[PDB]
């Protein structure tokens, strides 16, 4: 039953990797809007 628990933990890791991909696209959007902020300020 330990292998099933490890598989469930790997599924949780996959879900968190999906959240990390969401974080990465959020980060690229943040970089784009930071460039926009710097362009509109200067």
């Amino acid at each position: 039953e330990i292998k099933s628990l490890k598989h469930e933990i790997k599924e949780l890791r996959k879900e968190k990797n999906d959240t990390l991909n969401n974080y990465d696209t959020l980060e690229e959007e943040t970089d784009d809007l930071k460039n926009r902020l710097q362009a509109l300020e200067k």
Binding site: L33, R36, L37, L40
Partner: peptide, 7 residues
């Protein structure tokens, strides 16, 4: 950004 597009 909105501020920089509000003024």
């Amino acid at each position: 950004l909105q501020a920089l597009e509000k003024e």
